[PDB]
C-alpha cells in the first residue's frame, strides 16, 4: 500500500554535498568557545560512525531479507544516500571545520568512547543475528534501524540544530537538516515494513515483540542519558536534550505502530526553530418514491 | 488514575455476559465525593457567596439587584430542595467542566447545578420571585434546557452572548462584503456560530463597473470570510466556526464545492468555513428529468430585472433566465451535480442541504421574505432582506438578518412529568427574555432583525431517549405517531404563548398581518386533521394531558387572529451536542450514534452509556448507522410537519453503501418535505 | 518577429566592436511607421474626437466644460509643436501599451504622446488655457512627469484615483481592524497601493477584555491584510500590493519578519503584503553597545502609560519601559536582530527599513505627530494620527491617514532647460490640483489627512543620465554637489510655491503655526550653510540659473513666517517605475540597474539602454551593483539633506557579499541621516 | 587511480524516467507492426529482468565484498540505479505503450522463457557463490557482471537503438541511451576491480582465470544466440543483431583485459546512428564610522 508513494518521497528528496557551500561557516565557528568546538567535534564524529554502519550494514542487510522487487529498490536508494550521500557530506563538514590531525584525534576518542561503542555495538548485533528466512529476526533488525533512523541519531542532531537556530553555522547546519530529513523518512518506511511482520503474529508473539521492543528502547534510552551528560554538560544543555530524546523516541515507537512511551514535553524553542465512498451514477427512478 | 475513571471504565468489564451500568452511578458518586465537594467554594451563608460573585466580577449585578436577598434565598432553597443527581458521571462531568462557573485561575469550583440553575433562573424571570421559582422547578426537573450560550452565561459580568446562531445577509458590494466579514469577526466574538448567504454576490467572471471578468466569485469572499473567523476564534478557546450558503442556481456552485474537496489546492481550500447549498425545487425537477441545467450570474440577472436570482422564485424564473439573452448563464448536468454533492458530502459531510422550496411551501412569513438559506447547524429558516451597507458619511439601508434564542425541551423530563404546556409555555416565556435582553452593537442588521422578528427557537432533546425507554423503536410507526402528537401538542402550546404575549404587550412581530398565522392559512391543517395519537400505547403515554383537538385549534387560530403573535419564529431544533449530556438526554431528535461512546479526556478514558441504557432496552437503543434513513427521514418530517423553523438532521451513513444510496437518502427527504440536511456522518 | 523588434534586438550585434545604439533610434520609426499610426484613430478635426471620447465614456465632461473648444484646441496645438519624438522605442513601447488610451476592444489607440498630454494639462489648469500650455509645455519638454496615477487617469471617466500612496494607521481593537481592511479593499479597487502602520496592535499571548493569552498577534491581522489585498486586485488587472510596518520594539517583530521567511509555513507566511520595520535610535545603540534589548507588549504600555508604544520616543522611554513591572517584555539580541534583518533582506529584500530618529530629527511636523511610518515604497514619510473607528451607531474619531502626490522632475531635461524654478512650482501648482480634487469616500482619515495637510509629493528622476551624460560618475563628490545644490534649488522653489499658493488662497495646512516652518527653525541649516556648488564643474552645469543663497533663504524664511505654507509635506522621491520609461530617464536617483536591460514581452525579446549611453559615457554609466553602496549611500542622505519627506532607497548587493555588508550598509545609512532603506536587490 | 573519478562520473549521471515524457512515442508506437511490436515488449522485458537481479542481487552482493568506504559507495550508487532507476523506466516504457494484459502477458512470458531463465540462472548463481575472504569466487562473480552489463543487455539494446536510428520511439530510445551510457561505466568499473584480482594471481592461477572467463563468455553466448533467434527471427534481424551482440563481448572482454576473440564484422549503421547568503556577525567595529 505504501512502498510506491515512498519511492517517490525519497527520489524527489535527492541531494548532493556540492550544493551547498561550506566555507562561509568559517565565520562564525572561530567565534565559538573550546567547550562548544569539542562538542560539536564529538556530536559530529557519533553521527558519522554511526551513519557508516547504516550505510555498509543496515540498510544493505535489510534489503537482502526484504522480499518485493519495490521494496528492495526503495532499500537500495536509501542504502546509497547513506554511502553515497551522507558520507561524503559528513567529511565535507569535517574538513571545513578541523585540521586533518584534529579529525583523526576527535574519531580515535569517539571510538574509544564506552556511551558511543555501547549503542553502536548494540545495533550492529541486531543485524548480525538476523537469519535467512526467518521474519521475526528480521523484525528485531527492523526494530534497531528505526531506533537508529528515529531516536538514536537525535541527541547527536540537536547540536548543529541548535547553533542552526541561533544563525551560527548554517551551511553546515543545512547540510545536517537535510540528513535528518532522510533519516525521518527512512525510519517511517523501515516501520511499515515493521509493522507488517508484527501484523502476521499471533497474539502471543505480538506480546513478545512488544516487550522486546520496549526493552531495547530502554536500554537505549538510558545510554542516551549518560551519552547526553557526557557530551552536553559542558556546555549546559543536557536537560533539554534529554526532552529531545524522549519527544523522538515517542516519533520511533510510532513508526512501529506503537503507543508514546514518554509524556509529552516542550521542545527547546531555537532547536525548534532550526527544525471516498464509491461513485455510483443515479440510475433514474430514484428521484420518485 | 481516578477513582471516578476506575469506576466508569468498570461498566464496559462485563459480569456475567452483561454490562455493569450501575458501575457508573458508582463514578459520579466518587467524582462528587472525591472531586468535585473538595474542589467547590463553599461560603458561610448564600450572602457571602454572591457578595463575593458580584465585586469579583463574576456575576452581573444588575439581574440580582432585582430580587431582595429574601427571594434569592428562595429561589435557591428552591432549586436546592429537589436534591437533583446527576444519573451518569459524564452528566456531572461535562457540566463541572464545561458550564460550572469556576475561579478566575480555573482551580476551583465556584457553581454547582442548582447554583447555576438559579441564576440563569433569576435572570430569566426578571425581578419575578414566582416566576423565578417556576423556572428552577422546571429545569431542575430537566424538563427545559436553555442553550449553551444561555446556559453558561446567564447572569454572568464576563459573558459574551445568549445568542448560539447568526445569519448575515450579503450584498453585492465591496462595501457589503467588508461590512460583512466587520460583522462576522464582531459575532465571532460574541461567541456565535455566523452563517452568511454568499447568493447575492456576482459569480467570477463578471464584471465591476464595465471593466468584465473582474470578480473572483464568492470563492474570494469565502477565504476571506475564512481568514476572517480564524482570526476571530473566540479569544483562542474555541476555533471559530463560519458557515457559507450558496444556491445550486449560483455560477460559482462547483467552485463553491470545490472549496470541500480533499484534492483542492490552498489558494481554493477553505477549511474553517462549513458550506451549505439551497436547492430549489426546480433543480430537483431538472435532474429527475435529466434535462441539462443552468447555472446563472448573479449581476447580469440583478442588471436585467433589478433584483438578486435568489430573491425570486426560480421555479416560475427559470425559463425566462434562460430564454433571456440579455442573461448569462453555463450550462451544467444536474444530475452530475447531485453526485458532486453526494460525493462531497460522503468525503467531508459537507455541503449543508436546505431544500428551498420545502422551506418556503409552509413558511410563515414569506411576505417580508422567502428563506433564502440556513445557519452553522440547518436549522434556523427565517425571512431574511439584505441590508445596503453604503459607503462612509453616507447612511446604510440596515435589512433583516437572522438571530434566534435556542432552548430546548427534554421530552423524557416533560412527558414524565405530563407538562408539556407548562414547559413550552416557560421555555418560550425564557426565550422570549433572551431575545429581549440580546442587543448587539456591532450588527446592525441583526439587532434589527432581534427586535422586529422577536423570533426563538425552542428545540427538543431526549427523543430517542424517551422512545428507547417506553419500548418503542426509533423507526417504528409507533415512534412517529409520537412525534406527530407530542410536537403537534408543542406547537400548540408555543402559538398559544406566542399570542398571549402578543395580548399581554400589545405588540405582534413586524410585519406579522401579511404572514399566514395573521390570515389563518397557517392553521388549515390543524384545524381539518386531528394528531391525536393513532396507537392505544402512545395514547396510554400521554394520559393526564389533554392532547389539543380541531375545536381547540380553531379556538387558538381564533385567539391568533384577535391578538396576532409576538414571535415570527418559535421552534427550532437544534443539535444540542454537549448540553445533551448535562440532561441526560440524547442529542435532539437525532437517534443515538452508539449506544455507549468511548471519550478522550487529557490522558484517560471514558464511557458514556446512553441515558437510560440497558438489558431489557439495548435493542431499543438501535445505532443511527444501523437504522434506515429513510425511516429516520420520516420521522423528521413528521416532526418537521409541526416545527416552523428547520431541525438539524445528520445522515448516518454505512461506509459500504455508495453515493447513489446517499444521493436516494437525499431526495426522499426532499420528497418527504425535509427542509434542511445537517450531516453525513459516515461510520 | 515585427520589423520594430529587429531593429531593437540589432543593438546587441556588435559593428566594430561597438553597440548600435543609433539602430534603436530607427525601431522607433519602425514602431510608428508599422504599428502605431496603423492602429491610431485619427478624426476629421479636433472636435470630433473631443465628442467621440466624451460620449463613449472615455473622458470626463467636467474638466473639459472648463475651457472653450478654441483653448483647447490651442492647448492641442501647443502640444503638437513641439513635435516631439520618443528617442528610444521602449519609451513609445511603453506609454502605447501602458498609458496611451484604447479602445473598450484594446485594439485601435485614441491617444496619443501630445493628446494624452494636452489633456492632462487642461485637468491640471481646472479652467486656464494659459496655465494648461505652460503645463503642456513642462510635459512635451518632458521636464515633469506626473506619477502613473495621474498620467494615466486624468481626465478619464473609466479611471481609479489619481494617489496610490496610502498610509493607515490602525489602532488596537477588532473594530478598527476591520475598518482598516475595509478601506484597504476600498484603497486597492481605486488602484492605490496601501500601507498600515500595525505597531499600535498589541502582541501576540495579549490579554482581550482582561482573559489572558488570547490575542492572535499582528500576524493574524497581516493574514486578513494580505487576504483583503489578494482580493481587491483592481478588478483583476494588477496583484493587489500592500505594506505593513511593524516597530522593531514590538513585540512581534521576530514573528513579523518570520512571515517573509521560505521555510514559514502557510498559515504563517503572507505572499502579497510587504513588510517594513522601523527601527528608532534606541534599538541601533542597543545593538552598537551589544546590550539586550527588550521588545515590548504594547497593550501593557497603552494599559501603564495611556498611550501606545510607538505613541512616544522610544529613547527617553525604554528604560522607564524596562524598569517598570507591569509593562511585559521579552528579551532578545539586537544584532541578532540586525543580522535577522539582513539576512531576510538577502533573500528577499524585505522588510524596509525605517530610521525612526533619522525621519523626525528632520521632520517638520513633530507637532501634528512623529512619523512612525512609511509607504508601500519607503520614501512618504509624513505625521499619522491614529483613528478610533467605534461600533456601529457610534461616532468615529477621525485621525489623520497619509495620502501624499506624486510627480517627478526630470533632472536632465529641467536642468538643460535651466528651469528649476519654473518646473518645480507648476509641478507643486498641479500636485496642489490633484490633491485638491481627490475626494475618497470610503477612508476617512485619509480624505481629512488630504483635506488639512494639503501633502503632496514633488520627486525627480534621471539623477544618473543626468551625471552620466555630463561626464560625472554617480559616487563622484561631484555628483554629491551637484545633487546638493539641485536638490536645495528644488527644496528652495517649493517652499517658495507653497507660501506663494497659501498667500494667494489665504490658508496654510492645519497645525501649520506649530511646524518648524512657522518657527523658522526649519530654514536653519539654509540661513547658514551655503548650498552653492563647490566644484567649477557643477557651477557651469548650473550656469544661466540663479542659485538661492543664503539671503535668499532668509528671505523665503520671512516670507514664510509672514504668509505660511500651504503643504505640509512638499518633496519625496518615488522609484518612478514605469513613467521613467516614457520620460526616457533612469529610474528614481537610483543608479542604473544595468547599462542595456533586456525585457521579454509576449514571445518576443526587447533591449533598452539606458537614456543617453553611448561609448563616450559608457564608463560613466556605471551599474549600481558595481558601485560602492557607501557613496550611493552618502549620495542619498546628500539629497535626503534637502527632502522633507524620503526617498526610495534602494540597496544593490552582489551576490559575493555577506549579511555583514548588508547591515554595515544599513548602518552607515542610518549613520549618514538616511530616513529609509526600500530594497536589498541582489544581482 | 580511478573509484574518485567513478564517483563523480556515476552522480554527474543521476537521471529519472520522468524527466522524459513518453506520449510523444504514441503513434510511432501504434504504427509498428504486431511481430514489431512482441519484438520489442520481449526485448526490455529481457532487459528488465537482467536489471532486477543486478540491482537486487549482483552489485549489492559485490559491494559487500569489495573493501574501501568509496569503492562501495560506487557500487551502491549502481545497485540503486538498476533497480530503482534502469529496471523501473522499463515500465514507464510499458506503462505508456502497451494494454495492461500485454504487460501482464510479457512478465508471465519471462517466467517460461528458457533462455532468459537460463542467463539468469548462470549469472545469479555465480553471484551467490562468493565467499567472504576468496577473491577467486569474487572474481568469477565480477566476470560474470561485466558480461551482463558489456554483453548480455546488447540483444536487449540493438532494437529500441535500431528504431532510435530511424527516428522512431524516438523517447523511450532516449531513455534506453542514458541506461546504456551508465551499463558502459559500470561494465569498465567492475572490469578494473575483476583485473585487480587477476593481477594478484600466479601466472598458472591467471591461465585458469582465463579459461574460466572464456568457457563462460562461450556458454553464455550459444544460448545468447537461441534467445536472439527466438526474438528476431520474426523481424528479419536476428544475423544483423548476432554481429552486434559478438561485437560487444569483444568489448567485455577488454573490459576485462583480454584480448578480442570474435572477429570484426559491419554492424547495421541504423544502429551506429542510434548511439540563502552567507552569515557573518556584526562586530563592534561595524558600528562606528
Ligand atoms: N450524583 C450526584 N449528583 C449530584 N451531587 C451529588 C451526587 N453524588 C453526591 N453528590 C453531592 O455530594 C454529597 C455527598 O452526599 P451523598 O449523596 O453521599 O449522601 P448523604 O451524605 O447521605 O446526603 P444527601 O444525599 O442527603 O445529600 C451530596 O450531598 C451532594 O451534595
Ligand atoms: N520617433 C518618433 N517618435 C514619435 N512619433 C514618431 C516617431 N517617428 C515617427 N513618428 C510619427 O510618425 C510620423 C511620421 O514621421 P516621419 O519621421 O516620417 O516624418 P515627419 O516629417 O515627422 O512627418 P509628419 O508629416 O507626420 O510630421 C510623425 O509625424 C509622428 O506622428
Ligand atoms: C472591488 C472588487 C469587487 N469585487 C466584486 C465583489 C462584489 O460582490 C462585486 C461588486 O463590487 P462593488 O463594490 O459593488 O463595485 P462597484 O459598485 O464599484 O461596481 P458596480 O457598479 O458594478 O456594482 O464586485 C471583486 O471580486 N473584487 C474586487 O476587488
Ligand atoms: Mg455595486
Ligand atoms: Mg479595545
Ligand atoms: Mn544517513
Ligand atoms: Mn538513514
Ligand atoms: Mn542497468
Ligand atoms: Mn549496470
Same mark, same amino acid.
Not at chain 1, 526494530?143 to 533512523?149: D, K, M, T
Not at chain 2, 467554594?41 to 450572602?47: E, Y
Not at chain 2, 414569506?366 to 453604503?390: G, M, P, W
Not at chain 2, 401538542?489 to 399581554?504: G, H, L, T
Given at each position: ?6 519511492? *517517490? ?13 561550506? +566555507?562561509?561557516?568559517?565565520? #562564525? ?19 558519522? /560512525? ?5 550505510? +555498509? ?17 526503495? /532499500?537500495?536508494?536509501? =542504502? ?21 590531525? #584534529?579529525? +583523526? ?23 548480525? =543475528? ?46 545536517? +537538516? ?5 533519516? =525521518? ?8 515494513? =515493521? ?29 542516551? /542519558? ?28 510510532? *513508526? ?25 451514477? /443515479? ?7 | ?16 455476559? &452483561? ?132 446556559? $453558561? ?14 445569519? $448575515? ?83 460559482? %456552485? ?18 474553517? $468555513? ?12 431538472? @435532474? ?51 453526485? &458532486? ?18 422551506? !418556503?411551501?409552509?413558511? @410563515?412569513? !414569506? ?42 425541551? !427534554? ?15 416557560? @421555555?418560550?416565556?425564557? $426565550? ?35 422512545? @428507547? ?25 408555543? %402559538? ?125 437503543? &438501535? ?12 420521522? %423528521? ?9 428547520? %431541525? ?36
Amino acid at each position: 500500500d505504501f512502498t510506491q508513494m515512498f519511492y *517517490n518521497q525519497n527520489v524527489k528528496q535527492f541531494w548532493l554535498p556540492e550544493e551547498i557551500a561550506l +566555507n562561509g561557516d568559517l565565520l #562564525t565557528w572561530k567565534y565559538l568557545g573550546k567547550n562548544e568546538q569539542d562538542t560539536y567535534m564529538k556530536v559530529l564524529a557519533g553521527l558519522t /560512525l554511526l551513519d557508516t554502519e547504516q550505510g +555498509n550494514t543496515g540498510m544493505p542487510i535489510v534489503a537482502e531479507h526484504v522480499d518485493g522487487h519495490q521494496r528492495k529498490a526503495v /532499500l537500495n536508494f536509501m =542504502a546509497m544516500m547513506e554511502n553515497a550521500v551522507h558520507a561524503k557530506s559528513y567529511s565535507n563538514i569535517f574538513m571545513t571545520l578541523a585540521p586533518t590531525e #584534529t579529525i +583523526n584525534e576527535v574519531f580515535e576518542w569517539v571510538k574509544q568512547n564506552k556511551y558511543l561503542q555501547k549503542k553502536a555495538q548494540m545495533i550492529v548485533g541486531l543485524y548480525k =543475528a538476523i537469519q535467512k528466512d526467518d521474519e521475526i529476526s528480521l523484525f528485531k533488525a527492523m526494530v534497531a534501524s528505526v531506533y537508529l533512523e528515529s531516536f538514536l541519531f537525535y541527541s547527536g542532531f540537536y547540536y548543529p540544530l541548535y547553533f542552526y537556530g541561533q544563525g551560527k553555522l548554517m551551511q553546515s547546519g543545512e547540510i545536517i +537538516n537535510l540528513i535528518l530529513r532522510d533519516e =525521518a523518512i527512512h525510519g517511517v518506511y523501515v516501520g511499515l515494513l =515493521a509493522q507488517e511482520i508484527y501484523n502476521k503474529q499471533t497474539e502471543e508473539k505480538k506480546a513478545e515483540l512488544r516487550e522486546f521492543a520496549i526493552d531495547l528502547l530502554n536500554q537505549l534510552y538510558e545510554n542516551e /542519558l549518560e551519552y547526553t551528560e557526557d557530551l552536553y554538560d559542558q556546555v549546559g544543555l543536557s536537560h533539554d536534550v534529554k526532552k529531545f530524546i524522549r519527544y523522538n523516541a515517542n516519533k520511533a515507537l510510532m *513508526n512501529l505502530g506503537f503507543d508514546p512511551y514518554f509524556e509529552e514535553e516542550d521542545i527547546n524553542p531555537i532547536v525548534l526553530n532550526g527544525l471516498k465512498a464509491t461513485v455510483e451514477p /443515479l440510475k433514474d427512478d430514484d428521484f420518485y418514491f | 488514575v481516578p477513582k471516578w475513571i476506575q469506576l466508569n471504565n468498570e461498566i464496559m468489564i462485563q459480569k456475567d455476559g &452483561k454490562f455493569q451500568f450501575d458501575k457508573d452511578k458508582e463514578a459520579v458518586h466518587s467524582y462528587f465525593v472525591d472531586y468535585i465537594n473538595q474542589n467547590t467554594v463553599f461560603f458561610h451563608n448564600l450572602k457571602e457567596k454572591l457578595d463575593y460573585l458580584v465585586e469579583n466580577q463574576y456575576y452581573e449585578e444588575e439581574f440580582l439587584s432585582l430580587y431582595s436577598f429574601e427571594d434569592i434565598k428562595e429561589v435557591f432553597k428552591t432549586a436546592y430542595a429537589k436534591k437533583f443527581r446527576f444519573p451518569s458521571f459524564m452528566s456531572a462531568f461535562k457540566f463541572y467542566n464545561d458550564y460550572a462557573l469556576k475561579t478566575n485561575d480555573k482551580k476551583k469550583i465556584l457553581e454547582r447545578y442548582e447554583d447555576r440553575i438559579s441564576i440563569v433562573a433569576l435572570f430569566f424571570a426578571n425581578g419575578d420571585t414566582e416566576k423565578a421559582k417556576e423556572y428552577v422547578n422546571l429545569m431542575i426537573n430537566q424538563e427545559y434546557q436553555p442553550s449553551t450560550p444561555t446556559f $453558561l452565561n446567564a447572569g454572568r459580568k464576563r459573558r459574551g452572548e445568549l445568542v448560539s446562531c447568526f445569519l $448575515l445577509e450579503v450584498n453585492d458590494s465591496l462595501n457589503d462584503i467588508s461590512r460583512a466579514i466587520d460583522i462576522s469577526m464582531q459575532l465571532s466574538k460574541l461567541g456565535g456560530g455566523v452563517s452568511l448567504n454568499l447568493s447575492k454576490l456576482r459569480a467570477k467572471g463578471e464584471a465591476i463597473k464595465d471593466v468584465e471578468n473582474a470578480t473572483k466569485g464568492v470563492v474570494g469572499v469565502m477565504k476571506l470570510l475564512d481568514n476572517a473567523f480564524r482570526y476571530a476564534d473566540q479569544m483562542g478557546q474555541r476555533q471559530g466556526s463560519g458557515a457559507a450558503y450558496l444556491n445550486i442556481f449560483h455560477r460559482d %456552485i462547483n467552485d463553491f464545492l470545490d472549496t470541500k474537496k480533499i484534492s483542492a489546492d490552498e489558494d481554493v481550500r477553505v477549511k474553517t $468555513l462549513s458550506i451549505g447549498v439551497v436547492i430549489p425545487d426546480k433543480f430537483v425537477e431538472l @435532474a429527475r428529468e435529466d434535462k441539462a441545467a443552468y447555472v446563472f450570474y448573479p449581476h447580469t440577472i440583478y442588471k436585467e430585472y433589478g433584483q438578486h436570482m435568489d430573491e425570486m422564485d426560480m421555479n416560475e424564473m427559470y425559463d425566462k433566465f434562460v430564454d433571456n439573452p440579455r442573461v448569462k448563464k453555463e450550462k451544467i448536468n444536474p444530475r452530475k451535480l447531485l453526485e &458532486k454533492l453526494a460525493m462531497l458530502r460522503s468525503e467531508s459531510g459537507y455541503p449543508y442541504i436546505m431544500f428551498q422550496d420545502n422551506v !418556503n411551501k409552509v413558511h @410563515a412569513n !414569506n411576505h417580508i421574505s422567502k428563506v433564502k438559506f440556513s445557519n452553522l447547524c440547518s436549522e434556523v429558516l427565517q425571512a431574511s432582506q439584505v441590508s445596503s451597507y453604503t459607503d462612509y458619511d453616507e447612511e446604510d439601508e440596515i435589512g433583516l438578518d437572522i438571530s434566534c434564542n435556542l432552548g430546548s425541551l !427534554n421530552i423524557l423530563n416533560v412527558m414524565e412529568h405530563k407538562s408539556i404546556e407548562k414547559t413550552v409555555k416557560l @421555555a418560550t416565556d425564557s $426565550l422570549t427574555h433572551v431575545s429581549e435582553t440580546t442587543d448587539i452593537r456591532n450588527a446592525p442588521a441583526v439587532r434589527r432583525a432581534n427586535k422586529a422578528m422577536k423570533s426563538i427557537g425552542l428545540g427538543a432533546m431526549n427523543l430517542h431517549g424517551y422512545l @428507547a425507554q417506553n419500548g418503542i423503536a426509533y423507526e417504528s410507526p409507533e415512534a412517529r405517531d409520537f412525534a406527530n402528537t407530542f410536537f403537534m401538542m408543542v406547537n400548540f402550546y408555543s %402559538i398559544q404563548r406566542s399570542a398571549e404575549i402578543a395580548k399581554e404587550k400589545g405588540e405582534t412581530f413586524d410585519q406579522y398581518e401579511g404572514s399566514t398565522y395573521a390570515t389563518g392559512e397557517y392553521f388549515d391543517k390543524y384545524v381539518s386533521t386531528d394528531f391525536s395519537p393513532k396507537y392505544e400505547k402512545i395514547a396510554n403515554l400521554f394520559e393526564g394531558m389533554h392532547i389539543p383537538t380541531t375545536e381547540d385549534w380553531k379556538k387558538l387560530k381564533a385567539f391568533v387572529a384577535e391578538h396576532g403573535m409576538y414571535h415570527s419564529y418559535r421552534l427550532c431544533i437544534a443539535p444540542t451536542g454537549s448540553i445533551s449530556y448535562v440532561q441526560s438526554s440524547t442529542a435532539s431528535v437525532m437517534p443515538i450514534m452508539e449506544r455507549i461512546e468511548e471519550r478522550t479526556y487529557g490522558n484517560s478514558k471514558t464511557y458514556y452509556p446512553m441515558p437510560g441504557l440497558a438489558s431489557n432496552n439495548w435493542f431499543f437503543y &438501535k445505532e443511527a448507522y444501523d437504522m434506515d434513513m429513510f425511516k429516520v427521514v420520516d420521522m %423528521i418530517a413528521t416532526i418537521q410537519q409541526h416545527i416552523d423553523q428547520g %431541525i438539524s438532521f445528520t445522515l448516518f451513513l454505512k461506509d459500504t453503501m455508495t453515493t447513489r444510496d446517499l444521493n436516494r437518502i437525499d431526495l426522499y427527504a426532499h420528497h418527504r418535505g425535509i427542509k434542511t440536511i445537517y450531516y453525513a456522518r459516515t461510520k
